[PDB]
Amino acid sequence: ASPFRLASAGEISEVQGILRTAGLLGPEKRIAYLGVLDPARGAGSEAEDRRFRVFIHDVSGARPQEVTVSVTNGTVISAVELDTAATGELPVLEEEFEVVEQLLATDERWLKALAARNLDVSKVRVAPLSAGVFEYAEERGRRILRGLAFVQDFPEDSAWAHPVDGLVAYVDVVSKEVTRVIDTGVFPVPAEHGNYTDPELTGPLRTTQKPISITQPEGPSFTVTGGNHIEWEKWSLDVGFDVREGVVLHNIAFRDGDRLRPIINRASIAEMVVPYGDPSPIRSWQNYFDTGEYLVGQYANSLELGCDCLGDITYLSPVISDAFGNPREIRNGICMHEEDWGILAKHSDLWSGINYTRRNRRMVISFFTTIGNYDYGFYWYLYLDGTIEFEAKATGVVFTSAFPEGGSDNISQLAPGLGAPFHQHIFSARLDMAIDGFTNRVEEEDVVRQTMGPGNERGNAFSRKRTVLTRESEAVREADARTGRTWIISNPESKNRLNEPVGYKLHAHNQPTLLADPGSSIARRAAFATKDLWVTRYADDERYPTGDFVNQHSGGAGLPSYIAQDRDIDGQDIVVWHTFGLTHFPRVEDWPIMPVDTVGFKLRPEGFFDRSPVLDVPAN
């Protein structure tokens, strides 16, 4: 009876029934988002109220609605009509993707663009991409996708190898109208295929790899109770799943002796942005928020044993809603397992003669999603020593273009005539902090260099300083790798045995943040991505760094709007938002399918425990 259990097929059917009976889910309506709501602060109210938030699209052009329902009481709690021209459009629907290609195939401007290139329309695939917000007045209040074309020589062909450059179209997906077709000129379509299963490209497959067998003969050391509650090596947490954010971790806590100590109340990747750096009018609008606009949870892969997840794997199969309110199961959508992680601690002491070695281990919780050409893996790691780590793994096929004759400063060439525009993949981690409870504060810690002089006559001394972040208006921080800058989240009211406040230290990778001009559209809409660290005061409605409705919103929503409230965050219920990203200058080695690259962050205890928390690990 945990309030944090996964939504069941029955609850989603119940939500469908409640909405139908209320007159809110007739034949012209579509569910664009459905997800359970987290309990409010202070769950002392006995018996849970399972509430679901629903975004309802209307395929006849009527205004969409935000609806909250309670499946425990079978009632609609609230239903709000939305002004999308003010507060943004709903997330893209899956059935709207398939529509961009079909319309264009009968538009005469599109057909004459293809004829001039001697391209057969039956072979042209259209990548349907989110539109953004630029200088096209007629788009405001309309639901628009943009399309870029790729040639597929046969049904099994990798279309990404054959971009049709100089051509882009804009499609109104509700009225089914092609608003614009832009043809800036013909480019040669690159002719080499990129088919990575074709023996003529791969050569003979290696025979030199022998199997690695990872087994757990007595089963794994973690237990799962209540469907989704995990206990492993003093850690306790619940694994949630949201169709928008994907895997969500709740109630991360650590058993320190006879007391359960909270660390993180809720952890998620709350937004994702992929901005492209090609100034060509064909692609200069190209940005998408995979989480906010497409919902990355709903594109999770079924993960196959021995291929995606190797070892003794426990699977969760989350349930989401389709566009009509029917439950859909993502089978084997979440993998969890533990894996060996080398040496934990080691010392051979000459004075005592004692030799000491212990192994480390980590709990892995992961899923994979696929949007178009991209494939992203989200990995959460819990370690024996109290460390929590997140890792994003980026792979798939690079988004391609023609490579211009005479070169480009914003595209790299992967093959004769084939380019790959420069871009970033930038993530926002939302960490609802609860270090030993909810009274928390954040300090910025910088290394401090000291000058040679009195009290330091040999010039060897160095130190550090910590600056407390007391209000939101001062809580927008940038990285500084040169001074070893880190951030500590502590509880000023909970002290270790040395009478110092307990804490956790956030270690960033210090990769570049959003590179676009600060006056650009994408800088306004992805404002969170311009700084490495934000801290806000907790509020139930402040869930996403870009706002609730990111699709075609003009910008400034989310974090810059939260921060302007200038709320007290010194010993308060606070939320940490960490931006981190990969800047991708594609390489020849990324073609025709890229090897994984990674980015992330981690948190390590800093005076949280009264000594090493792994003294009780045995030798084996």
> Would you say 411 is a known binding-site residue?
no
> Would you say 196 is a known binding-site residue?
no
Q: Which is nearer to a copy of itself, 1 or 205 (CB)?
A: 205
Is residue 383 flagged as an active site residue? Answer: no
Residue 523, binding choice from Na ion, a copy of itself, Cu ion, none, Cβ under 5 to 8 Å by partner class? a copy of itself
Measured distance CA(51)–CA(34) in Å, rounded: 11
User: Which residues ranging from 59 to 118 are in contact with a copy of itself (CB under 8 A)?
Assistant: none
Measured distance CA(312)–CA(305) in Å, rounded: 9
User: Which residues ranging from 505 to 564 are in contact with Na ion (CB under 5 A)?
Assistant: 538
Q: Which of 46, 81, 120, 457 binds a copy of itself (CB under 8 A)?
A: 457
Residue 584, binding choice from Cu ion, a copy of itself, Na ion, none, Cβ under 5 to 8 Å by partner class? Cu ion
Q: Name the minimum Å distance from CB 309 to a copy of itself.
A: 9
Q: List CB contacts of 173: < 8 A, sequence separation 6 or more.
A: 96, 99, 100, 143, 144, 145
Residues 335 and 303 sit within 8 Å (Cβ to Cβ): yes
Q: Which of 104, 522, 533, 603 binds a copy of itself (CB under 8 A)?
A: 522
> Would you say 315 is a known binding-site residue?
no
Question: Is 517 a residue that touches a copy of itself (CB under 8 A)?
Answer: yes
Helix (H), strand (E), coil (C) string for 397-430? CCCCEECCCCCCCCEEEEECCEEEECEEEEEEEE
Catalytic option among 374, 379, 381, 562: 374
- Rg of the chain in Å (alpha carbons): 26
3-state secondary structure of 492: strand
User: Which residues ranging from 534 to 593 are in contact with a copy of itself (CB under 8 A)?
Assistant: 583, 585, 587-593
User: Which residues ranging from 215 to 234 are in contact with a copy of itself (CB under 8 A)?
Assistant: 215-221, 233
Q: Which is nearer to Na ion, 283 or 578 (CB)?
A: 578
CB atoms within 10 A of CB 312: 17
User: Which residues ranging from 260 to 279 are in contact with a copy of itself (CB under 8 A)?
Assistant: 275-279
- Taken in order 466, 469, 470, 474, the sign of the CA dihedral is positive
> Would you say 378 is a known binding-site residue?
no
Measured distance CA(556)–CA(533) in Å, rounded: 17
Q: Name the minimum Å distance from CB 426 to Cu ion.
A: 11
Measured distance CA(46)–CA(39) in Å, rounded: 12
Measured distance CA(294)–CA(376) in Å, rounded: 13
Catalytic option among 238, 242, 278, 290: 290
Rounded to a whole number, what is the distance in angstroms from the first to the last CA of the chain?
37
Measured distance CA(256)–CA(261) in Å, rounded: 7
Is residue 290 flagged as an active site residue? Answer: yes
> Would you say 170 is a known binding-site residue?
no
Q: Name the minimum Å distance from CB 173 to a copy of itself.
A: 18
User: Which residues ranging from 420 to 439 are in contact with Na ion (CB under 5 A)?
Assistant: 432-433
Question: Is 605 a residue that touches a copy of itself (CB under 8 A)?
Answer: yes
Residue whose structure tokens are 């006849």 = 60
> Would you say 288 is a known binding-site residue?
yes
Give me 179's structure tokens. Answer: 């608003």
Q: Which is nearer to a copy of itself, 32 or 282 (CB)?
A: 282
Numbered residues of the known binding site for Cu cation: 423, 425, 584
Q: Which residues are catalytic?
A: 290, 374
- Feature table: binding site: 288-299, 371-376, 423, 425, 584
